[PDB]
Amino acid sequence: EFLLLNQDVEENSKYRTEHFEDILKQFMGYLDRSNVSIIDLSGIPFEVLSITISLISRL
Amino acid sequence: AGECLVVGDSTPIPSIVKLELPNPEPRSQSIKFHKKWSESWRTPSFEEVIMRWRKENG
Numbered sequence: 305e306f307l308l309l310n311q312d313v314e315e316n317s318k319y320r321t322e323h324f325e326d327i328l329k330q331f332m333g334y335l336d337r338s339n340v341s342i343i344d345l346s347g348i349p350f351e352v353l354s355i356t357i358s359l360i361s362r363l
Numbered sequence: 364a365g366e367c368l369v370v371g372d373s374t375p376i377p378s379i380v381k382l383e384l385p386n387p388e389p390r391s392q393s394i395k396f397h398k399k400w401s402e403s404w405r406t407p408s409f410e411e412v413i414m415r416w417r418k419e420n421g
Contacts, residue, residue: 325413332406 306348328363 308316319327330337343360345353365384370377399405415421 325409331409335404335406 307352 308319311317325331330339330341333339345356348356366379366381368377368379411420
């Protein structure tokens with residue numbers, strides 16, 4: 305569900321291309337957040353782990 | 364640092380040669396990490412930068 309593959313739900317469909325600047329998240333750091341970032345790839349199924357890491361690194 | 368070996372037919376002996384510093388130095392700029400840190404808070408503008416991400420004003 306983290307990839308929001310079921311777009312039949314309205315909540316998964318409310319994310320538009322305008323909702324792009326805030327998906328970056330801590331992009332500047334809330335103006336007070338530091339940037340200690342932990343991408344806890346623990347519970348994610350493995351067959352999309354490489355895909356997720358590639359996504360984040362390329363972004 | 365500052366030494367290279369010239370290998371070729373133009374020389375009898377390929378050797379290490381100490382090259383004097385060129386003057387003026389070309390604009391060799393490599394970003395260094397730490398000094399940018401510890402400089403209070405840096406706040407880039409984002410409207411323009413995501414605008415450039417879309418190949419609008421590149």
